Amino acid sequence: GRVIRGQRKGAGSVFKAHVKHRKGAAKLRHIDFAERHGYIKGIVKDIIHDPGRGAPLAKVMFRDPYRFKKRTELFIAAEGIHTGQFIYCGKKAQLNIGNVLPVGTMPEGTIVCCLEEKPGDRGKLARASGNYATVISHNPETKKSRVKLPSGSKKVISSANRAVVGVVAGGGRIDKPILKAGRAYHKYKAKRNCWPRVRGVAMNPVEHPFGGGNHQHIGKPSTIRRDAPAGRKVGLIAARRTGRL
RNA sequence: GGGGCGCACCACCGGCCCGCCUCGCGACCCUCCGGGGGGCAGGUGGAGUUGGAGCGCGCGCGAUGGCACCCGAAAGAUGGUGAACUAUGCCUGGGCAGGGCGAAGCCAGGGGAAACUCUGGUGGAGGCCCGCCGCGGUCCUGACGUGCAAAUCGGUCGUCCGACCUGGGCAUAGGGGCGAAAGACUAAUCGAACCAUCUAGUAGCUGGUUCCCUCCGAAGUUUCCCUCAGGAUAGCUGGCGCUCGCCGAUCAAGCAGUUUUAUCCGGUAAAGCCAAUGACUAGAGGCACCUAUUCUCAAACUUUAAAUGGGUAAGAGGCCCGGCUCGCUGGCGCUGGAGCCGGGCGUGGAAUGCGACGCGCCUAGUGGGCCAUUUUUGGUAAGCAGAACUGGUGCUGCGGGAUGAACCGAACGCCGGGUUAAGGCGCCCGAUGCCGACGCUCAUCAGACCCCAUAAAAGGUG
RNA sequence: GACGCAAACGAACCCGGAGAUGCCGGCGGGUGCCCCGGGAAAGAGUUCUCUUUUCUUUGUGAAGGGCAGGGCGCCCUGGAACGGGUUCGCCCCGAGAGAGGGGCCCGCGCCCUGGAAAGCGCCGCGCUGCGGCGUCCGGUGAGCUCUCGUCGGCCCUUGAAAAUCCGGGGGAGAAGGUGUAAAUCUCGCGCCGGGCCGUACCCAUAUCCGCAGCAGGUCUCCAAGGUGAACAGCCUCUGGCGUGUUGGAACAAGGCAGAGUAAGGGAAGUCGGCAAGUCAGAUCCGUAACUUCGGGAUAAGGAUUGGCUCUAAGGGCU
RNA sequence: GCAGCCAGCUUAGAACUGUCGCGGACCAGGGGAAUCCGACUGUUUAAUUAAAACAAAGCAUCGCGAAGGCCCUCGGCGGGUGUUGACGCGAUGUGAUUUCUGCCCAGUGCUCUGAAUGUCAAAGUGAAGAAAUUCAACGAAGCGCGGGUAAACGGCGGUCUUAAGGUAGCCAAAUGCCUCGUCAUCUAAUUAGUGACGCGCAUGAAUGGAUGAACGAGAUUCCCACUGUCCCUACCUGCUAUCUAGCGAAACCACAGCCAAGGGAACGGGCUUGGCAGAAUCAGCGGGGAAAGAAGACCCUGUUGAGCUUGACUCUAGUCUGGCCCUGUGAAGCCUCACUUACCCGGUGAGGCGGGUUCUGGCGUCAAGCGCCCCGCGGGGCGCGACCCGCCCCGGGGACAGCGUCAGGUGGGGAGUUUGACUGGGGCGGUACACCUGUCAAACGGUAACGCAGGUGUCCUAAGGCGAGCUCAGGGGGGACAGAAACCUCCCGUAGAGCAGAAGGGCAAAAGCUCGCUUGAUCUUGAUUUUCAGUAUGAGUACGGACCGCGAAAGCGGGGCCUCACGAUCCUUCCGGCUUUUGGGGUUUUAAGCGGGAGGUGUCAGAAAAGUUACCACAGGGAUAACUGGCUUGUGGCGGCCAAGCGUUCAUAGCGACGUCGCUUUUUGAUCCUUCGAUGUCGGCUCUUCCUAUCAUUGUGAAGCAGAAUUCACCAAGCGUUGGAUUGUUCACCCACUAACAGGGAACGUGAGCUGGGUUUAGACCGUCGUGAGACAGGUUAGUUUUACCCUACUGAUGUGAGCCGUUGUUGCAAUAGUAAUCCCGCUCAGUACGAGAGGAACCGCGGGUUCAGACAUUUGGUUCGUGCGCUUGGCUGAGGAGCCACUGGCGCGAAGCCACCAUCUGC
Numbered sequence A: 001g002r003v004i005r006g007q008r009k010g011a012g013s014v015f016k017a018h019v020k021h022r023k024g025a026a027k028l029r030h031i032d033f034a035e036r037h038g039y040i041k042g043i044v045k046d047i048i049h050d051p052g053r054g055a056p057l058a059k060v061m062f063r064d065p066y067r068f069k070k071r072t073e074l075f076i077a078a079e080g081i082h083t084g085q086f087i088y089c090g091k092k093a094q095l096n097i098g099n100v101l102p103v104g105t106m107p108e109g110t111i112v113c114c115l116e117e118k119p120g121d122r123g124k125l126a127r128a129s130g131n132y133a134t135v136i137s138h139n140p141e142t143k144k145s146r147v148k149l150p151s152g153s154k155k156v157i158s159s160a161n162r163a164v165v166g167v168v169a170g171g172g173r174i175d176k177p178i179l180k181a182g183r184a185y186h187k188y189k190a191k192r193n194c195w196p197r198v199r200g201v202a203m204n205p206v207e208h209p210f211g212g213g214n215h216q217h218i219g220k221p222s223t224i225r226r227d228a229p230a231g232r233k234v235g236l237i238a239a240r241r242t243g244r245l
Numbered sequence B: 001g002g003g004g005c006g007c008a009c010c011a012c013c014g015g016c017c018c019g020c021c022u023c024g025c026g027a028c029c030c031u032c033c034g035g036g037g038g039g040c041a042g043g044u045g046g047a048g049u050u051g052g053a054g055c056g057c058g059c060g061c062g063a064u065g066g067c068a069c070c071c072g073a074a075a076g077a078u079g080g081u082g083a084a085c086u087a088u089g090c091c092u093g094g095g096c097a098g099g100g101c102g103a104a105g106c107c108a109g110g111g112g113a114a115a116c117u118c119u120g121g122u123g124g125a126g127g128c129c130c131g132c133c134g135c136g137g138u139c140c141u142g143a144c145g146u147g148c149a150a151a152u153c154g155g156u157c158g159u160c161c162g163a164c165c166u167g168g169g170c171a172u173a174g175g176g177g178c179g180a181a182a183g184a185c186u187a188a189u190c191g192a193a194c195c196a197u198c199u200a201g202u203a204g205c206u207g208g209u210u211c212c213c214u215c216c217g218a219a220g221u222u223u224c225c226c227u228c229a230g231g232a233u234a235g236c237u238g239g240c241g242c243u244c245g246c247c248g249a250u251c252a253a254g255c256a257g258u259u260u261u262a263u264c265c266g267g268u269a270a271a272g273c274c275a276a277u278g279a280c281u282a283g284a285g286g287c288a289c290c291u292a293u294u295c296u297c298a299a300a301c302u303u304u305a306a307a308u309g310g311g312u313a314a315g316a317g318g319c320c321c322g323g324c325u326c327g328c329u330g331g332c333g334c335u336g337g338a339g340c341c342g343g344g345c346g347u348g349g350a351a352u353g354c355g356a357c358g359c360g361c362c363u364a365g366u367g368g369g370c371c372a373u374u375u376u377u378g379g380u381a382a383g384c385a386g387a388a389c390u391g392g393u394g395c396u397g398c399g400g401g402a403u404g405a406a407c408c409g410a411a412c413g414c415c416g417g418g419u420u421a422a423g424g425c426g427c428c429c430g431a432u433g434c435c436g437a438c439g440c441u442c443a444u445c446a447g448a449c450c451c452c453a454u455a456a457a458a459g460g461u462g
Numbered sequence C: 001g002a003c004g005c006a007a008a009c010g011a012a013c014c015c016g017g018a019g020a021u022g023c024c025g026g027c028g029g030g031u032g033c034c035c036c037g038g039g040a041a042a043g044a045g046u047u048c049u050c051u052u053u054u055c056u057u058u059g060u061g062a063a064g065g066g067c068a069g070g071g072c073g074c075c076c077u078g079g080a081a082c083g084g085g086u087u088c089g090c091c092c093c094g095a096g097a098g099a100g101g102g103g104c105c106c107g108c109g110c111c112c113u114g115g116a117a118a119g120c121g122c123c124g125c126g127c128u129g130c131g132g133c134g135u136c137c138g139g140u141g142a143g144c145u146c147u148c149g150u151c152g153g154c155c156c157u158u159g160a161a162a163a164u165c166c167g168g169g170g171g172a173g174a175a176g177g178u179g180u181a182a183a184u185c186u187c188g189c190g191c192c193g194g195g196c197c198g199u200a201c202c203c204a205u206a207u208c209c210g211c212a213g214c215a216g217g218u219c220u221c222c223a224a225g226g227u228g229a230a231c232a233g234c235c236u237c238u239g240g241c242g243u244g245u246u247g248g249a250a251c252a253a254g255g256c257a258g259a260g261u262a263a264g265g266g267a268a269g270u271c272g273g274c275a276a277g278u279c280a281g282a283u284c285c286g287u288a289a290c291u292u293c294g295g296g297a298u299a300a301g302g303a304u305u306g307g308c309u310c311u312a313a314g315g316g317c318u
Numbered sequence D: 001g002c003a004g005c006c007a008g009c010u011u012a013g014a015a016c017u018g019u020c021g022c023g024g025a026c027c028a029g030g031g032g033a034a035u036c037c038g039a040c041u042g043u044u045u046a047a048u049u050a051a052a053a054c055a056a057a058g059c060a061u062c063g064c065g066a067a068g069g070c071c072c073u074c075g076g077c078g079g080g081u082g083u084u085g086a087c088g089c090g091a092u093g094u095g096a097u098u099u100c101u102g103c104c105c106a107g108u109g110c111u112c113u114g115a116a117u118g119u120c121a122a123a124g125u126g127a128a129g130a131a132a133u134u135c136a137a138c139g140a141a142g143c144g145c146g147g148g149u150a151a152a153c154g155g156c157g158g159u160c161u162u163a164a165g166g167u168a169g170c171c172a173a174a175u176g177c178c179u180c181g182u183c184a185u186c187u188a189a190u191u192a193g194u195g196a197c198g199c200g201c202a203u204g205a206a207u208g209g210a211u212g213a214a215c216g217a218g219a220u221u222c223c224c225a226c227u228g229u230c231c232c233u234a235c236c237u238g239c240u241a242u243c244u245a246g247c248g249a250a251a252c253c254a255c256a257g258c259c260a261a262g263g264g265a266a267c268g269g270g271c272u273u274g275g276c277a278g279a280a281u282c283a284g285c286g287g288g289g290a291a292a293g294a295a296g297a298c299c300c301u302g303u304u305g306a307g308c309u310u311g312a313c314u315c316u317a318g319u320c321u322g323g324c325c326c327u328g329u330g331a332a333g334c335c336u337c338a339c340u341u342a343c344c345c346g347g348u349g350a351g352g353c354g355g356g357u358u359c360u361g362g363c364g365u366c367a368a369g370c371g372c373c374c375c376g377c378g379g380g381g382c383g384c385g386a387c388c389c390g391c392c393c394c395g396g397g398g399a400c401a402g403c404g405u406c407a408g409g410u411g412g413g414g415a416g417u418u419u420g421a422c423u424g425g426g427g428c429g430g431u432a433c434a435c436c437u438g439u440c441a442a443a444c445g446g447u448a449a450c451g452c453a454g455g456u457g458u459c460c461u462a463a464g465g466c467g468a469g470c471u472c473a474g475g476g477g478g479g480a481c482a483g484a485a486a487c488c489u490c491c492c493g494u495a496g497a498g499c500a501g502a503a504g505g506g507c508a509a510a511a512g513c514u515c516g517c518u519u520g521a522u523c524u525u526g527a528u529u530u531u532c533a534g535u536a537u538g539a540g541u542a543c544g545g546a547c548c549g550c551g552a553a554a555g556c557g558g559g560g561c562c563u564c565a566c567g568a569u570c571c572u573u574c575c576g577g578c579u580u581u582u583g584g585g586g587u588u589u590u591a592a593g594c595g596g597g598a599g600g601u602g603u604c605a606g607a608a609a610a611g612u613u614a615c616c617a618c619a620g621g622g623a624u625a626a627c628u629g630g631c632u633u634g635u636g637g638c639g640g641c642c643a644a645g646c647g648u649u650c651a652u653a654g655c656g657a658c659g660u661c662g663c664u665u666u667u668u669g670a671u672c673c674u675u676c677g678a679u680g681u682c683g684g685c686u687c688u689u690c691c692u693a694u695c696a697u698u699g700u701g702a703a704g705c706a707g708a709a710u711u712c713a714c715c716a717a718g719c720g721u722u723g724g725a726u727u728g729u730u731c732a733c734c735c736a737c738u739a740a741c742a743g744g745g746a747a748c749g750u751g752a753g754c755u756g757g758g759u760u761u762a763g764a765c766c767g768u769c770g771u772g773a774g775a776c777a778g779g780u781u782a783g784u785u786u787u788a789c790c791c792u793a794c795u796g797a798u799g800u801g802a803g804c805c806g807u808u809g810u811u812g813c814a815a816u817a818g819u820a821a822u823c824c825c826g827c828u829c830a831g832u833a834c835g836a837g838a839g840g841a842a843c844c845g846c847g848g849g850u851u852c853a854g855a856c857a858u859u860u861g862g863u864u865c866g867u868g869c870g871c872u873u874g875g876c877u878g879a880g881g882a883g884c885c886a887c888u889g890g891c892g893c894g895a896a897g898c899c900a901c902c903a904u905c906u907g908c
């Protein structure tokens, strides 16, 4: 047979992301002295739309403490923030929606967003629209804090991980049922070339292990092992269970 | 007319050498620690030996490895070149009459006790409608179909603000790409592009394989083979000889797809079942059976038993006699037996024919056969399928059967004369143009000769 | 006050602007074109009859100055309910309407410099270039384009970067000591320079690709009059052209096309209403089953349609 | 409060008016009632499939928190997703909405455990041994075991029964073979359509079920309207064809080109026997040249491929896991926890590490200030402001990730290869593939077929060897229980029993039975028979040499009474040998070798081996299938003979049982002779001729013929044999009509004649089947039908006896060839014959018609580019007038021509 569609996406020729009109990488201000021993005052300049994501981005303007300059940061817009408000980032920052402060300095049950997975990575978790992370518990002895991720998973992270207080703006985006295939065309035209998905049963055996036969049946158990080779790992990869549930 | 030395070669019997086996095991001069010998004999294995024949060169042919007689694949591999077509994506540009339905929003006026409703207008939303350009390509299965065109033309038709159309610049490259998925597209090439090379790839498979004359002349069968379109092998074929015989007296041997004589072998035809095994019909007698009869049968039944056929023997390699040898055999060195040696006796002791189809070596082709009389299996039968003997044919023309592969006659250098075969002799068309013999036969579908080109049961006061 | 003055020092560094923002709809301003009236001038066409007629020509570059016109969430005064202003739609208003008076931007429109000297039109003379006259005055529009605006609509779509240029913040610095100096973004003026490469032509029913002068393919710009809803079809002007690799003569069969026509019947043809026939535009009426209430729908089914002569209504301006 | 002036363009109404004509040209939806499928728009096989296929929104599941999921790369812990972060990315299924989505976790697969008993690599560990080595313990992942999971693949039965037994629904469906199901409806008639019925060959619930507005160049049925689709064709125009001037190919070609029969490679053009036969040509035409185009694409074969799939064979990338390696340090009880410096990751312009500014959508830029010091009031430096020290920039991991290297598992993701043969084509079946008996087999031997009837891959320490004794099968007479069969006994008993087995042979003091002694079923050499090449192996025979058994002995026995019961090389294994080598010697292990067994190749002289291809390819094959033709005629069809019987009686008016003889090639087979470098394949349409086994008509005979009607038979193919519904249909069935609605042939006539409905490429759907790719001889939908100008034949059209007193013309003759008419009705006969009636003819005569033939245009109708006349739309020449343009602008009428059973005439 030939190389299946799923394998051709790793070479990245026509499957690369469409990043022409994107405004930049949304990430927290990198950890410095002002965020380890205090807070820095930042003004929200504009809340812009990032092509490819349903979550708006805030252009928060900060002031460089070592040189006379104004640092422009592209944060994940927390739902509720607005242009003209002051966003405070640091250890001594107050618990307000939009502020950035470590998880160790926030009480249990605090709803946060743009949460750092490791101290300094400038935000990795809870970045999509309407999502958030809850601070479950703390541990001052080990300086570790337990948080709840939007997938229901509970991860033990460091207490120095910075996060934005609040929920990511643009919530409820998946609640509007797309009606036209054209709206799905434009939805993925800004993200990547992945929208029109031909079924493997609708192909020939040369390009998919589910194709072929005088009917469009799968023919083989759709649940495939995890150690299956690339080109065979299609269907339900390492499915623990199936059915309506 | 007698004797003899006997070449080469062949048959047989020995001797010896090496391997192996069995038997015999012993005292002894080579033991000098260790050890080497000890007629050993009787068998058997060996590509040995018993008075070398090879080596080199050349020539011819055969079977091989090689491009291997020539041309031919579908492929496989290595390296490379293409996204000017097209597929998708990216970037930056360009483009899409006039109408139709007419949503939210808004205005005003009616109805109502209120909740609120009703009407008109406005408004201009939509993968909305008609439709031009554009982009597509439904039907006519129209035109065309060596065309205008290696996909075009006409009318008709789909869509025509959207998942729209489109340029340029970019990206993805061959087991890779790309694919709203047709195995589609990737430069007229796609169920794996193109180019060059490996490569003159291999082919048990088609095709072709070049001058003459002369001579000889097949096989389609055996066994084996992942064989059954091929090979190996035997047979059939040719060539090369050679050993002789005739020369030197059918001298005689020897031989034979043939008889004769003698001697065996067989279980088929026929026959038989009142004989066995099995099948089967009918009465009859006796105290369903039992006895004597009876009808009808066998390929896997048979007492009996041919024709044709198979083997063997028809002499000097015989016959007769004597002596000798033996470890085998044993009442009996003659009891067997066999071997060795010598002597005696042609009236070569059936017919016919023939030089020995003698002894070798090398060897091509073939290993699809087909047909006829007879025999014979399966089948309703077949110009069917499968066997047996022989001939034919393939390979073969000629006379005849009009015609023809195979029937009939007869096989062939180039001719003249003669005469025939099979078949014919009204005319075509050589030959009855006989005063041919006797009879049969009338058909309003007559009849007219192997194979052979169809005719039956049953009928006629012809 | 918005902001204006020919200029009107100023670095490092910082901030911001322009470059630099999609598609669609409505409306408005301006050109171009088209159209109407001059009983307008200059030639021309017709003049059998009629036609104060028909046709053609009646213009001004860049840049600069001035002024219409358009735009402005720009300013000042002031204060709104009996709310008012206002658009086709909307929208706007004590975060300040209306009104009054200003300011700014765009002005591709008009006038002027250019610049009538040139260009067109007409007439005249000369020859084998010189002169004359004219180049005028208006009307409009559901008109068509282009463009500048404005207000919206749409997106689970938000519709580029950079070179370059500019403003501000900054006040580090520079300048002279009584008339000048430093400094000058003064289209105030003068002086000098701007190299290299492409540039013809075809651009398609004969200059490209398809082997060709191939009915194929190949990205754009400009675009008139009449009919009409139309960038439809049909006709005409400007421009182009000889009918698309040949002529002549016949008009048989059989073809291809004209989607030619055909009495009576009307799908009996045929696998099958294949084929083309019917219907068709517009106006006025009338529109079911079913439904996701959106539709179905131009459902279906009707009537009307010419020409001519009138009536009525729908405007603007002083 | 308007008067004056200016400015258009629409709308409504009315009169009048022409031939009731007017969106006059042009432009420009036929409609309705239903079924199926897909929701829709969109997309798709460039060059045969625009679709019901793909996509789609929606729905659902799966994976994954980044040291990650998915994927790329030869490789860098490089790259894509990712300028991403679960409202995300990645992998699948289903396919809008509505309505539901049942049961099954046994199987397969996925996944989760590890109170995990097994299986279990490398390394490490222990023991034995001179050591190589052997043995043992230990023993990861995975497997096994256990649980979960079906919107995972899939499945969802006849008291039996499993894993669940098809639930809601739906249906003779795009799914039902039987089948053209049954009923209803739709029509005169319906294999169609629709609605029902459902044990449904073989429906069914996200392999989604049911429904469904809107939509569709989708499939189907009906109705209205409409029409040349047809009845039934005709006329006109343009461009051609045609002729001409100029110009000027190609395909194709053994030679060629009249037929009938014959035979032949079984369908000649040439050959045979006949018919016969006259230059040179034109326009047509499509019968033939088994016409051309193309080394059949179907089929088979080849030890030729390729695409693709799996539970094929053998590997492999990746991945999982273990050991070693970078890999060090500290502590505690191999394991755990710590250490940082290896290594790894993250952040940053490496900007503050360790120890001692929240009151606003301002502003913040190289230090003010102070202290100290140096230049000649201008100038400069330094320090504090801005604390000191420090060894690693700051975080997060950490000797774990990860790299390297072996080891185990997984691995159709990928690679390579295979997937027997025989065979009345192949496949399926079977084994005729290695053997044995009888027969075939034709009296030596041998002798074939997918001939016949059978057997074999064993069995036996005796069922081998030997000796002795005994006699069997069966029948009869008898004899307590005891009988048709228990046991005793007598007589008869050629074997008719038994001998392991198939059958044949052989066997009576044996070869059978019984008994007691045994291991000749042992060890060896060669010869030899059978199969045979006269090779091997297997299976036999006769000996010789050993050592034995049994018997008193002669003797018998080296397996089975005989004919069957079996296996090369290589390798492994075992046994045997004072006997070899282990090589520079010696010793000892090991290894090798020699001799003999065993381990096995059943395709049995012995490869290690699953499919599919309708996406297919190549070399070939008429050695071999699917057509026609040929042979044959079982079968099908048709006709006889005999005469039991039927016919009230009466065999034979008409029939014909049991039997039997034929014919025919319009059935189907059998065969495989022709054709695979191709003979175009079903049906219909069209058109011609032929056969008679005669439906009708003509002339007859017969009757269980009164008439009428009908039946049987004869001469006889002259003439006719229809229009429709359904189905692609030949074949059926029905509706009507009719004198009758007879059956056939001609390559199962006829595709360069047509039409493609069907079959029979590639698209796609359903059901069943298969794990799958795929299959269906099941259904369904869409799917390029190319070329003639050559030679004949035929159709017409020119011309033709090259020699002559012939040339030329008129009127004619005529061989030969073609040939043509046909059937019906009405009146009359006549309500008559006939008959009891009911009913009910015929000849002559008369008047018409059907089908056909040949004409013809007076009439009617059609056509009209005489572009003849009128009218008229848009435009154009200024207008009138007169005209033109729109490939014939349109409309009405229309001459002449041509033309219609749509008008007319004639047919012996």
Ligand SMILES: [Mg+2]
Pocket (backbone or CB within 6 Å): A193, A194, A195, A196
């Ligand atoms: Mg895509």
Ligand SMILES: [Mg+2]
Pocket (backbone or CB within 6 Å): A197
């Ligand atoms: Mg999806």
Ligand SMILES: [Mg+2]
Pocket (backbone or CB within 6 Å): A197, A198, A199
């Ligand atoms: Mg899909």
Ligand SMILES: [Mg+2]
Pocket (backbone or CB within 6 Å): A202, A203, A204
């Ligand atoms: Mg497909």
Ligand SMILES: [Mg+2]
Pocket (backbone or CB within 6 Å): A201, A209, A210, A211, A212, A213, A215, A216, A217, A218, A219
């Ligand atoms: Mg499949």
Ligand SMILES: [Mg+2]
Pocket (backbone or CB within 6 Å): A216
């Ligand atoms: Mg599906």
Ligand SMILES: [Mg+2]
Pocket (backbone or CB within 6 Å): A201, A216, A217, A218, D207
């Ligand atoms: Mg499916």
Ligand SMILES: [Mg+2]
Pocket (backbone or CB within 6 Å): none
């Ligand atoms: Mg001698």
Ligand SMILES: [Mg+2]
Pocket (backbone or CB within 6 Å): B076
């Ligand atoms: Mg290969």
Ligand SMILES: [Mg+2]
Pocket (backbone or CB within 6 Å): none
């Ligand atoms: Mg593209």
Ligand SMILES: [Mg+2]
Pocket (backbone or CB within 6 Å): none
């Ligand atoms: Mg169009």
Ligand SMILES: [Mg+2]
Pocket (backbone or CB within 6 Å): none
């Ligand atoms: Mg077309």
Ligand SMILES: [Mg+2]
Pocket (backbone or CB within 6 Å): B138, D217
């Ligand atoms: Mg269609």
Ligand SMILES: [Mg+2]
Pocket (backbone or CB within 6 Å): B139, C274
């Ligand atoms: Mg059609």
Ligand SMILES: [Mg+2]
Pocket (backbone or CB within 6 Å): B141
């Ligand atoms: Mg066509």
Ligand SMILES: [Mg+2]
Pocket (backbone or CB within 6 Å): none
């Ligand atoms: Mg043609």
